[PDB]
Nucleic acid binder design. Structure first.
Lengths: 378, 128, 59, 14, 121, 663
RNA sequence: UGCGAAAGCAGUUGAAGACAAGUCUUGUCGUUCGUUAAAAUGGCCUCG
């Protein structure tokens, strides 16, 4: 019964009125199951939400994570998206809903047609929602002490007009509308500041997919996330547990990290991650970096290419890696002037042989300078 | 849509409803499933179920009696009756006799009813 | 026109007997792979002929 | 139709 | 009884036993393993019939060897009683042979049964 | 006022339907899978794949060729594997088709007589193949896609095997041309391997041969339902191999059969054009195991070759077709009482006819033969005959009309046309790259340059190859299950701007000089028509649900798009036939013409509109100023000849005599 | 419908009530008052 259903979870009542987006995943995971059974058993969704969440602002925001989490049924997701539309009307409005339209974009990135179609309608309401310049839980939404730096909401909503006036939810390409022609660069910046401060990996993946452009794979905000990637591998196991908690494929998230890597990689901090990821202990991280490094290696400085050649031959000779680094070595295209310096670099006997195997693996390459150092070796 | 005849099975599982168009529909009371039997070209005037319910007796303006075998959807014929069939009944512990009512609609001035008791075995008139 | 008809038979004739030897002409490998093989007319024509036999009085 | 017909095999032959 | 192979099915046994009963009337049937063996030695057998259920089955496993060497058709039936039954004798017959006669009045179905036994083998 | 040239001198005749097959096993409890599709076999060798969602839209077509046919179709749906389709062409080959490309993935010879029947076991790891020589061949497929291996040959007999059915994987049931039903054991680890356990003989017509055309196994009642040339429907006890019931229902041969998930209904059809429904739904019937001839219906004008059934929580489909060349769709639960649709014989999802505004030339291609007409009243200027057996996929004519490009999956050939004596002289320009090039879609940039999308979806420019970059598509479970949804469906080139639509709905803008790809749209419903308008600088996309979307080329979707996408007139929404063709109005660029198989519509994009059953309910996802006329139908192709001239092209067998009593 | 011969000679049809469809306009009647006043593919035994 409802009363018994409360008593079973009476201890599981949110003292905080904040989103479950910020709460423990496992505690939220059970609570979501309670939300579905409550409405399924005829227990009023709002009554359930009041029962185990403090305030209406929690009832709206727990439903948000129901949308963020793919495990929730899509029909449940629209009911989640419908009731938030109810609660955005109830709230006092002197603070801004520019905060949640990225969540609506994430809601656009949720699967079903009907959930997306509603989200435009909800999105269109937020455009009509006036701009206050100081947001809902501006220092409390995504983190307790995490203050979100956001656009001028006039630019956001007049832009968000584009979503209502100039987009249909049936389509998965928000990216063109996501980037306005008039201020594509000014807006490209804040998403970085958002995505730095968007915690959920699912929100990052869906957000990054829209942002990344073929000319620039997050070129401008690669510097912004350089710290995240540089220690992403350090806490990647902690990111991997989040994705399974978020019920997402982490390998796609790993591809989002290399999607963060810019196309041309004279850039020093992205190359540090791709190399570190490629030789990372994690089996899945390094393959995505390995494929990324191949895309990188085409777009490198010839000297930057040259340095990578020395590491992989030297690693394969001595460093036994889970992946065929000498096999990777064969795939990478190795310049003749590159082939010779690497022979000079080692002209350590075991490391030498693989270089002399490395030049062998690349048949039919011609340069006079090569044969000079060759003869120096033998 | 206009029903002209109706017959309830003894068990009550089957209900045959006729129509002015000449179509007969047997309905299973358990699940309201319909089964269409369509031979009569005019309104069916008389329907009656057999004691076991395996056979349906139908008669109408055709002046011909149809014994529908429901097991195989077959039907046996007794044609050239004197008048159109107003009523049909199986009269016997073993369905030995069929009792029939004829109208002879040719005489418009008066309704001339003729009662025909038939033998099921050879379909030869036992008492007119 | 009769010469044209005979030319079609020569094109039709992909195999013919030279003295004590029989040749066949070779079709392209692309034709065989790109599309499944040709149906035989006699076996399939037999069924349709049965389906349109006179006894049916098909009309 | 023979007036406006074009046959590739005949065209190929000559 | 894995040794007996090929074994005629229920329908195929029908026509074989029918021909055997016919061949009995027209004196074109040789009954018994050794008597069947003699026909194969003389090459006068259209084909050889054996019973699958016979115990020990090895008593008849020589006939396949003769039949294969002489390229003579052969086939097995499930029951030996039924074989001797069709032969027209009061005892079980585990094997029998049909004598070759191109002038016989029952020739056609013998070839037809033979043609099927060719298919079975 | 505008000029109409109504044209029926162009004749395109569909091939007779021969086989039908659903891609999934019916499950009433579960919801309809997104990957459900219907395969249609044609007598010309064409295989058509359709989607029962959003009414019925045809996702892909496999082109047949000369003197080839389809007589049996079979799906295999293994979990974790792509949907697998098999076909028999009436010869000694089982063809495995690459659904991604539509080409034969593998051709396997049965090492036996010509194939008459094909069937798959419930585990979907074995195919049963019926041969005319009475041999039934068992083929392994569990090895993998593209892997066909000989497993076992069942006991041989002398009667042609006309049909085959399975019981789980243990036994094979086959109807034969001798009027006998035959059962064989496929049980592995059993001494009765390949042996004929029982033989059942139907009642035989005295004066003519008796043929068992169709047989089906009924798991719930462990019975066999058989159709025979005598018009008899017979129910047989499986374990005892005995006749339970016999019904003389049809007046001619019963060619095919089908049943529902619960085996509560058996549906028979064939030569007499009638569909007879056999019912065992009543509880008393179930206890007694007795069927009832519930009803029959006359819906086809000619023989019903094929019937198939699908059911789910949101689907209830009985699809039938045959010599009439049209699909008839019914509800199994309400076959007697439910409404029906007769599918149009031709829906031009792919256009077989083009109209050239300059020179007033109308070109139609059918079965490797191309005809060109000129109209001032119409004259056949020239007729082209092509040697290669494979049917023409697409034909494109240059903006001058001199250069005609003929495309086939095997080869692409270009022919120049010169007007001499009110006739066109044909000269084949030789291009080695095009000859070796597969052409799924071809379009003209100008009188010289063309854009060709290969069957592998490699887009390149040929001047008469400059490859064009294409964005990568993320793999999805639906894409793995159905490969071709990720393949390019529509290719349009409009003033250097090229737009490609994939079956999954991916729309991208391609710049041909730049040869770079920029994502525009990714629709969640199948895209049925695309149009690019340079004047409004927008791209019009229409989905399977007949919603219209107009995308500015870089805020994307024109302001008209919001106010009118969900506010379309009643006519557009009410249509059960999807839009397939869009062409602009010369007089005014904003006005756009839209037409389907049976309707033509015009919409002004500068004006906003006043706000004021036989298909899947679509609970599940697809993956994972105004003028309307219906007078002209059916429409092969519609387009403008001049600013004031409209071209409408329209379509212009011995069957059973079922007399209609009249008094 | 009445008279008359079969030929014909005279004349007749309205008011509601209820329901279904559209969205206020239309249809239907196992319902009333008054006036003399086509169409569910559906054919008819055995007993030689």
């Amino acid at each position: 019964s409802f009363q018994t259903f409360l008593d079973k979870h009476s201890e599981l009542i949110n003292t905080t009125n904040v989103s479950m987006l910020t709460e423990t995943g496992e505690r939220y995971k059970k609570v979501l199951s309670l939300f579905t059974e409550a409405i399924g058993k005829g227990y009023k969704a709002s009554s359930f939400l009041t029962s185990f969440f403090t305030t209406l602002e929690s009832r709206i925001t727990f439903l948000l994570r129901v949308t963020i989490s793919p495990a929730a049924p899509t029909a449940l997701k629209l009911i989640s998206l419908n009731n938030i539309a109810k609660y955005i009307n109830s709230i006092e409005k002197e603070v801004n809903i520019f905060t949640l339209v990225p969540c609506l974009i994430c809601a656009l990135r949720d699967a079903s047609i009907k959930v997306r179609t509603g989200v435009k309608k909800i999105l269109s309401l937020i455009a009509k929602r006036p701009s206050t310049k100081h947001y809902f839980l501006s220092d409390k939404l995504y983190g307790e002490n995490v203050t979100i730096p956001m656009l001028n909401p006039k630019d956001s909503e007049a832009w968000l007009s584009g979503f209502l006036n100039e987009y249909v939810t049936e389509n998965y390409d928000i990216s063109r509308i996501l980037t306005p022609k008039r201020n594509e660069k000014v807006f490209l910046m804040f998403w970085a500041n958002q995505a730095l401060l968007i915690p959920s990996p699912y929100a990052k993946t869906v957000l990054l997919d829209n942002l990344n452009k073929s000319p620039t794979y997050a070129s401008s905000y690669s510097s912004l996330f350089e710290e995240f990637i540089s220690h992403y591998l350090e806490n990647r196991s902690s990111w991997e547990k989040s994705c399974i908690a978020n019920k997402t494929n982490f390998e796609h998230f790993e591809r989002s990290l290399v999607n963060l890597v810019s196309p041309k990689e004279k850039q020093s901090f992205m190359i540090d991650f791709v190399l570190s990821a490629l030789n990372s202990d994690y089996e899945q991280l390094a393959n995505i970096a390995a494929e990324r490094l191949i895309s990188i290696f085409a777009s490198l400085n010839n000297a930057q290419k040259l340095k990578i050649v020395q590491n992989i031959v030297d690693s394969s000779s001595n460093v036994e890696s889970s992946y065929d680094t000498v096999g990777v070595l064969q795939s990478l295209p190795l310049d003749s002037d590159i082939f010779v310096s690497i022979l000079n670099q080692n002209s350590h006997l075991r490391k030498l042989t693989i270089i002399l195997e490395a030049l062998d693996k690349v048949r039919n390459v011609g340069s006079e300078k090569l044969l000079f150092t060759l003869l120096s070796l033998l | 849509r206009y029903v002209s005849s109706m017959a309830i099975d003894n068990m009550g599982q089957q209900l045959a409803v006729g129509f002015a168009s000449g179509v007969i529909s047997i309905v299973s009371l358990a699940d309201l499933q319909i089964r269409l039997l369509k031979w009569h070209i005019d309104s069916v005037l008389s329907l009656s179920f057999s004691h076991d319910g395996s056979y349906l007796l139908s008669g109408g303006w055709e002046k011909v009696m149809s014994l529908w075998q429901l097991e195989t959807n077959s039907q046996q014929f007794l044609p050239r009756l004197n008048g159109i069939i107003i009523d049909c009944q199986v009269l016997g512990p073993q369905g030995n006799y069929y009792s029939l009512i004829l109208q002879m609609t040719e005489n418009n001035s008066n309704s001339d009813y003729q009662f025909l008791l038939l033998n099921a075995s050879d379909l030869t008139s036992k008492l007119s | 026109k009769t010469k044209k008809r005979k030319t079609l038979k020569n094109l039709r004739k992909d195999s013919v007997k030279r003295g004590k030897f029989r040749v066949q002409l070779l079709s392209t490998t692309q034709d065989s792979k790109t599309l499944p093989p040709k149906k035989e007319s006699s076996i399939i024509r037999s069924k349709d002929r049965w389906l349109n036999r006179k006894a049916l009085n098909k009309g | 139709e023979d007036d406006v017909e074009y046959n590739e095999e005949l065209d190929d032959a000559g | 009884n894995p040794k007996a192979f090929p074994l005629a099915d229920a329908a195929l046994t029908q026509q074989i036993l029918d021909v055997v009963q016919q061949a009995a009337n027209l004196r074109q049937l040789k009954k018994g393993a050794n008597e069947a063996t003699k026909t194969l030695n003389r090459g006068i057998s259209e084909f050889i019939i054996m019973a699958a259920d016979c115990e020990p089955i090895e008593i008849l496993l020589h006939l396949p060897l003769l039949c294969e060497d002489k390229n003579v058709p052969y086939v097995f039936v499930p029951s030996r009683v039924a074989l001797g039954r069709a032969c027209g004798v009061s005892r079980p017959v585990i094997a029998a042979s049909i004598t070759t006669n191109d002038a016989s009045a029952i020739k056609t179905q013998i070839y037809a049964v033979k043609d099927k036994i060719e298919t079975l083998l | 006022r505008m000029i109409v040239h109504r044209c029926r001198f162009v004749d395109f005749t569909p091939a007779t339907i021969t086989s039908l097959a659903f891609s999934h096993k019916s499950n009433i409890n579960k919801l309809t899978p997104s990957d459900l599709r219907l395969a249609i076999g044609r007598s010309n060798g064409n295989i058509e794949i359709w989607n029962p969602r959003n009414n019925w839209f045809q996702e892909m077509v496999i082109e047949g060729g000369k003197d080839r046919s389809i007589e049996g179709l079979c799906w295999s749906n293994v979990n974790g594997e792509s949907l697998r389709l098999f076909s028999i062409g009436g010869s000694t080959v089982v063809t495995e088709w690459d659904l991604a490309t539509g080409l034969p993935l593998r051709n396997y010879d049965c090492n036996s007589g010509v194939i008459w029947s094909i069937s798959i076991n419930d585990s979907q790891d074995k195919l049963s193949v019926g041969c005319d020589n009475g041999t039934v061949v068992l083929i392994d497929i569990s090895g993998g896609p593209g892997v066909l291996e000989h497993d076992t040959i069942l006991m041989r007999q002398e009667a042609r095997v006309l049909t085959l059915a399975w019981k789980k994987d243990d036994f094979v049931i086959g109807g034969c041309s001798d009027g006998r039903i035959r059962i064989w054991s496929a049980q592995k680890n059993d001494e009765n391997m390949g042996r004929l356990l029982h033989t059942m003989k139907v009642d035989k017509a005295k004066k003519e041969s008796t043929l068992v055309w169709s047989v089906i196994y009924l798991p719930r009642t462990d019975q066999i339902a058989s159709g025979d040339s005598t018009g008899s429907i017979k129910f047989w006890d499986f374990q005892f191999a005995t006749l339970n019931q016999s019904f003389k229902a049809h007046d001619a041969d019963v060619l095919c059969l089908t049943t529902d998930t619960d085996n509560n209904y058996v549906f028979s059809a064939g030569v007499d054009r009638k569909i007879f429904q056999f019912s065992q739904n009543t509880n008393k019937s179930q206890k007694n195991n007795r069927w009832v001839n519930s009803s029959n219906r006359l819906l086809h004008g000619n023989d019903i070759r094929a019937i198939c059934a699908y059911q789910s929580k949101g689907a209830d489909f009985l699809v039938s077709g045959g010599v009439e060349k049209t699909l008839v769709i019914n509800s199994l639960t309400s076959f007697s009482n439910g409404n029906y649709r007769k599918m149009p014989t031709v829906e031009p999802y792919s256009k077989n006819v083009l109209v050239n505004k300059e020179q007033r030339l109308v070109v139609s291609w059918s079965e490797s033969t191309v005809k060109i007409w000129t109209m001032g009243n119409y004259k056949l200027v020239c007729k082209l005959t092509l040697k290669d057996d494979q049917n023409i996929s697409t034909c494109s004519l240059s903006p001058d009309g001199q250069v005609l490009v003929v495309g086939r999956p095997s080869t692409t050939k270009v022919f120049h046309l010169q007007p001499v004596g009110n006739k066109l002289k044909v000269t084949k320009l030789d291009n080695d790259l095009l000859l070796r090039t597969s052409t799924k879609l071809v379009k003209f940039i100008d009188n010289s340059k063309i854009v060709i999308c290969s069957c592998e979806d490699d887009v390149f420019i040929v001047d008469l190859p400059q490859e064009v970059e294409l964005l990568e598509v993320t793999s999805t479970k639906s894409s793995i299950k159905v490969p071709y949804i990720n393949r390019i469906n529509h290719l349009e080139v409009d003033q250097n701007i090229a737009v490609i639509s994939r079956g999954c709905g991916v729309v991208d803008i391609l710049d041909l000089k730049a040869r770079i790809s920029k994502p525009l749209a990714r629709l969640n419903n199948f895209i049925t028509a695309v149009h690019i308008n340079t004047s409004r600088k927008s791209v019009v996309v229409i989905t399977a649900d007949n919603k219209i979307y107009e995308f500015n080329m870089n805020s994307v979707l024109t302001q008209w798009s919001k106010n009118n996408t969900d506010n379309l007139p009643k006519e557009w929404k009410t249509l059960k036939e999807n839009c397939v063709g869009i062409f602009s109005d010369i007089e005014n660029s904003s006005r756009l013409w839209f037409w389907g198989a049976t309707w033509i519509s015009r919409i002004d994009f500068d004006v906003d509109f006043p706000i004021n059953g036989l298909t899947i309910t679509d609970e599940s996802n697809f993956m994972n100023h105004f003028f309307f006329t219906d007078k002209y139908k059916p429409l092969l192709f519609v387009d403008l000849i001049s600013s004031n001239e409209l071209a409408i092209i329209e379509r212009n067998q011995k069957a059973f005599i079922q007399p209609k009593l009249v008094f």
